[PDB]
Enzyme design. Sequence first.
Site, PDB file in Angstrom:
ATOM      1  N   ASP A 103       0.876  -1.163   0.000  1.00 25.62           N
ATOM      2  CA  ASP A 103       0.000   0.000   0.000  1.00 25.62           C
ATOM      3  C   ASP A 103       0.917   1.218   0.000  1.00 25.62           C
ATOM      4  O   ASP A 103       2.126   1.078   0.180  1.00 25.62           O
ATOM      5  CB  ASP A 103      -0.899   0.007   1.241  1.00 25.62           C
ATOM      6  N   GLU A 111       0.925   5.815   0.739  1.00 23.64           N
ATOM      7  CA  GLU A 111       0.216   6.977   1.238  1.00 23.64           C
ATOM      8  C   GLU A 111       0.856   8.135   0.479  1.00 23.64           C
ATOM      9  O   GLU A 111       2.078   8.189   0.318  1.00 23.64           O
ATOM     10  CB  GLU A 111       0.407   7.157   2.746  1.00 23.64           C
ATOM     11  N   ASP A 124      -1.955   3.647  -6.697  1.00 21.89           N
ATOM     12  CA  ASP A 124      -0.707   3.057  -6.224  1.00 21.89           C
ATOM     13  C   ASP A 124       0.165   2.730  -7.429  1.00 21.89           C
ATOM     14  O   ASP A 124       1.380   2.910  -7.397  1.00 21.89           O
ATOM     15  CB  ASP A 124      -0.962   1.770  -5.435  1.00 21.89           C
ATOM     16  N   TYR A 140      -2.302   3.700  11.234  1.00 22.17           N
ATOM     17  CA  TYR A 140      -3.285   3.676  10.157  1.00 22.17           C
ATOM     18  C   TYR A 140      -2.636   3.076   8.914  1.00 22.17           C
ATOM     19  O   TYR A 140      -3.193   2.178   8.281  1.00 22.17           O
ATOM     20  CB  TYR A 140      -3.771   5.088   9.827  1.00 22.17           C
ATOM     21  N   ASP A 158      -3.309  -0.897   6.863  1.00 25.96           N
ATOM     22  CA  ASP A 158      -3.668  -1.101   5.469  1.00 25.96           C
ATOM     23  C   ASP A 158      -2.992  -2.302   4.823  1.00 25.96           C
ATOM     24  O   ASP A 158      -3.455  -2.788   3.789  1.00 25.96           O
ATOM     25  CB  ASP A 158      -3.406   0.169   4.657  1.00 25.96           C
TER      26      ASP A 158
END
Length: 375
Positions: free
Chosen positions: A28, A30, A85, A151, A155
């Site tokens: 993942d 961010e 992504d 957080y 993920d």
Amino acid sequence: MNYQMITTDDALASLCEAVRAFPAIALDTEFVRTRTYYPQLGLIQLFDGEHLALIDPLGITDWSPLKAILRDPSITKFLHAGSEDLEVFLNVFGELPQPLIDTQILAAFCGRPMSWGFASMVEEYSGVTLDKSESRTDWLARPLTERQCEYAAADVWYLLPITAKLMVETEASGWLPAALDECRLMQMRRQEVVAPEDAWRDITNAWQLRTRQLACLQLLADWRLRKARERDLAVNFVVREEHLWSVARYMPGSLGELDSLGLSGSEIRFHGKTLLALVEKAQTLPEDALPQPMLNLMDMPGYRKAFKAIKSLITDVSETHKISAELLASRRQINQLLNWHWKLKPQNNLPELISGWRGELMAEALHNLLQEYPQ
Ligand SMILES: [Zn+2]
Ligand SMILES: [Zn+2]
Ligand SMILES: [Zn+2]
Ligand SMILES: [Zn+2]
Ligand SMILES: [Zn+2]
């Protein structure tokens, strides 16, 4: 749930040395949405079942160890709803991971909405209700807070067990080949790079222009995309799309005219002279160098009838194969097929509806349907 922050090349190398022995990893990222051309990456997360890492791109110089993991055929890479992504991966690594599977796509073939959210999926499989309090935070701020890290870690932490569950569910339904082909299709699309000379083709009202005006739009969009990539600014922050189109449509000959057309003071002081020069260049271009006018699909005889007919066919295929009609064909894909049928524009590959997994399901029916509309 314990995570490790990785901010040095050596730490990344050490992590990858351990990860290489595993059969799969959950991934993942961010990133923040600003005014830049390329998204600003704030973090990459990886989990192999034992090692949970939060990789800070700001501290890494040598990505080689991770890129090796990402191209390793013996390690399946997984993500959920990874369209963006993929974009970030291409920008930092120059290539997409492989093999790469998207659980949102797997779930869609299992009967879930193509937009099924990560939190909803986690709730369904783990019974855990995720905390979204840190979802919309500044991923470029440093140091990241513990809550932010948690957080980001969640993920990938909860994703890994679900990848195993969905791979079994998808295979058990007989849709695994199709789901993997669909994952490949999204990856291939993201890999496509728009050449500056073709930037104009993506302006949706370019078809309304005549030849000379279109030649102008081509030069203008080419220049704008190059400037955007040079300055690392989204194209609209260089010259607003509407403003660029107006320059192409009205072919202005002075700075005063650019003002009349609505261009901002900044657009004019920085790009005014250039824009006017591009207009003049298009004006003096020889006709044998001008582009061919675009053919608006919507204005082709039989379009509405064909579209409706195809939608009807998709519905029948959907009910027969017990697969979502939205997954079978989007409006974009139907139009792609018709643009191909009527040769309304250059296309590199065969339409998605009659290729890959979709073709295997309905190419014969689609070609039969198209016999009712002259090419
Ligand atoms: Zn090492
Ligand atoms: Zn380690
Ligand atoms: Zn993501
Ligand atoms: Zn995330
Ligand atoms: Zn320039």
